Design a protein around this nucleic acid. Structure first.
Lengths: 185, 148, 37, 54, 52, 49, 51
RNA sequence: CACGGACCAAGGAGUCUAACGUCUAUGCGAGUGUUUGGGUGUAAAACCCAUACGCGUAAUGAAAGUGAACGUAGGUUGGGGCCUCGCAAGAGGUGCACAAUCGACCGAUCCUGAUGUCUUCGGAUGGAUUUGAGUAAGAGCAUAGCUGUUGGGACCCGAAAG
């Protein structure tokens, strides 16, 4: 045998295809494996790997996250690319004129964009507009803003939440939470 | 789907998944939250601190109907107007016809002050009001009129 | 019907937070006025 | 040896490696003395004010 | 008038027919376009010869 | 056994709960049996609502 | 707009008036949830059994 | 030179459920869940639906209660991608997610006590090596699956007893 430096036969921990059985998503991977292998542009490798991402790693990109991203210096005429869902927002009031490319728009977001002069295209009419990724701006949504991330790492003095079912002054406030009762963690 | 469970992959292997040295037995450690401060103590001191004690006064016969006050922020305030009408007041922005927004009929017991509203005069009817959520209304030419 | 759609503005000088704050303490010091009387 | 050996413990420590603590730029200021820490708050403020007008 | 359309809305309350993830289904017809084919490096050797 | 980082659960199944469980397979049958005994009642009282 | 389908007689000959294809016939034909929604709606007519 | 096994057939042991943790798929998306019920039916199917309610969108405090923008929702350092320049190396511009750090804002705690004052109410303002399961352009709800948890006969068989 050999003196094995590192572990043998280890899968690289990245998925190479979606877990889903969506046929209308499997055709988008048949489009972007062609692009990312036969185009030297690095935009297509990004959208290829982003189509495999699970729903937890693919958070919704609200329509204010988009409208903020065009307030960058010299980025109004870009086309925004979101490889998740694009949801509406009733907290913004003026929205610019841009074309957004996305998997799934909601009903409120698709109505808001086309009202404001923009348009909504899917990720296959983007490839005829930008095969190399001309003037795109890949936005992403917040990942650590879930419910399940407030509980990761719960130990003493960490600042994380407890996994709890019902709150109130009777549930998990007494000992270890104040110096009156015992100690304070 | 029992054909997908791991009992089906465990036929043949003695001690089906549960080890041979320490077997699978009926309740080692007690039943339930037994031993919370005797032997499972350093679980409850790390993962659920705040257990094992008594804090606060008591409320005999608490009714949750008194403590009904669902909040609303200012950034969601124009949603209470219907969408085919809410833009009409945004375009015209006329002070002699400020649109009445009733928060209580929509089901809210307080209007709070998170967010910025457009500078359109509206009048808002609400049971309870925070100091910023009136300050940002009256700066917009608005009126808070209390209700009930 | 509640208050009808889109009436006019009569902004008076007093505020609604000051009213709710004063009416609360007027409830809270109901009886100590009679002890002071 | 039914009482506290340390045999096999060095094997187990070196399987997942003995990790260095990931030194970052801008380390924390939770232990530094509060007199310096209060004035460093106002020092960075007027610096950004002067670079606002630049 | 049951499932709605783009002009007639549905007789089911709050319902619009689901929308596509991808606009067309012949992916090779969008491969063989003007914009894709004029923006790719050239092909070669479906199976390549065994050197050495 | 208190085991891992999990919620503290209240499950009130320490009594003889298997004697008293009322599964509603009747949900389909009682809807027919109330739509029957309404139209029986509606024809019994003639015109009245 | 939509493709025009042909209305057939009761005897077989194609009657002249044509019908526009509706909007449901261009809905996404996704056989991965038709599989999932079938195998939990095919369970909705079961009867209980026990010993 | 430990225990079980004379041989053969058939039977024979991690199941189901209530409530949940992580992960994954799907639907919709600041919403979501039709099915307690009503309508309908080719009849325990399917199909349609009004009010409420559940969870979520707001936290904090024992409680009375208060209740989230100084700033193109901030400053810095990293940051994929995109853009500009050059044949190109490289240089500059913008920098989503995320990771460090310094602030701001809401609540509690401690302090400061301005107009006015029912003559002690009111709590503006400015603070602090304090504090929170918080804010800072929402991310959830529902259904399904493996694995894990707790109560249940609970992987099957077994006490001396009560």
């Amino acid at each position: 045998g050999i003196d094995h430096t590192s572990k043998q036969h280890k899968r690289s921990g990245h998925r190479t295809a979606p877990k889903s059985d969506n046929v209308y998503l499997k055709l988008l991977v048949k489009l972007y494996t062609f692009l990312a292998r036969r185009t030297d542009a690095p935009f297509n490798k990004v959208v290829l790997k982003a189509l495999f991402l699970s729903k937890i790693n693919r958070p919704p990109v609200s329509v204010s996250r988009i409208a903020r991203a065009l307030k960058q210096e010299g980025a109004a005429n870009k086309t925004v690319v979101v490889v998740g869902t694009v949801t509406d927002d009733a907290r913004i009031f003026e929205f610019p004129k841009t074309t957004v490319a996305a998997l799934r728009f909601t009903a409120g977001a698709r109505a808001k964009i086309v009202k404001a002069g923009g348009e909504c295209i899917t990720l296959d009419q983007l490839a005829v507009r930008a095969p190399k990724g001309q003037n795109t701006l890949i936005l992403r949504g917040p990942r650590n803003s879930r419910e399940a991330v407030r509980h990761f790492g719960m130990g003493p003095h960490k600042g994380k939440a407890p996994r709890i079912l019902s709150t109130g002054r009777k549930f998990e406030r007494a000992r270890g939470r104040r110096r009156s009762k015992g100690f304070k963690v | 789907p029992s054909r997908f469970t791991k009992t089906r992959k465990h036929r043949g292997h003695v001690s089906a998944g549960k080890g041979r040295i320490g077997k699978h037995r009926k309740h080692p450690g007690g039943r339930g939250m037994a031993g919370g401060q005797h032997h499972h103590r350093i679980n409850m001191d790390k993962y659920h601190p705040g257990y094992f004690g008594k804090v606060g006064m008591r409320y005999f016969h608490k009714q949750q109907a008194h403590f009904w006050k669902p909040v609303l922020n200012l950034d969601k305030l124009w949603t209470l107007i219907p969408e085919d009408k809410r833009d009409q007041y945004l375009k015209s922005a006329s002070k002699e016809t400020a649109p009445v927004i009733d928060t209580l009929a929509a089901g809210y017991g307080k209007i709070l002050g998170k967010g910025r509203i457009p500078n359109v005069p509206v009048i808002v009817k609400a049971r309870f009001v925070s100091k910023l959520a009136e300050e940002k209304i009256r700066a917009a030419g608005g009126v808070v009129e209390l209700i009930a | 019907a509640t208050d009808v759609e889109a009436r006019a503005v009569q902004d008076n000088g007093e505020s609604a937070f000051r009213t709710l704050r004063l009416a609360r303490s007027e409830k809270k010091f109901r009886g100590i006025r009679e002890k002071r009387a | 040896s039914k009482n506290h050996t340390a045999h096999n413990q060095t094997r187990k420590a070196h399987r997942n490696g003995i990790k260095k603590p990931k030194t970052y730029k801008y380390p924390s200021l939770k232990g530094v003395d509060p007199k310096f820490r209060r004035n460093h708050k106002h020092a960075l403020h007027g610096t950004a004010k002067a670079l606002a007008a630049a | 008038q049951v499932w709605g359309s783009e002009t007639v809305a549905s007789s089911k309350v709050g319902y619009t027919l689901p929308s596509h993830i991808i606009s067309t289904s012949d992916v090779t017809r969008i491969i063989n376009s003007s914009e894709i084919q004029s923006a790719i490096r050239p092909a070669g050797q479906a199976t390549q010869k065994r050197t050495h | 056994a208190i085991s891992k980082n999990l919620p503290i659960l209240k499950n009130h199944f320490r009594k003889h709960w298997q004697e008293r469980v009322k599964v509603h397979f009747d949900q389909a049958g009682k809807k027919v049996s109330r739509r029957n005994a309404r139209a029986t009642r509606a024809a019994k009282i003639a015109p009245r609502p | 707009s939509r493709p025009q389908v042909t209305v057939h007689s009761l005897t077989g000959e194609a009657t002249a008036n044509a019908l526009p294809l509706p909007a449901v016939f261009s809905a996404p034909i996704r056989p991965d949830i038709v599989h999932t929604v079938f195998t939990s709606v095919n369970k909705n007519k079961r009867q209980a059994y026990a010993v």
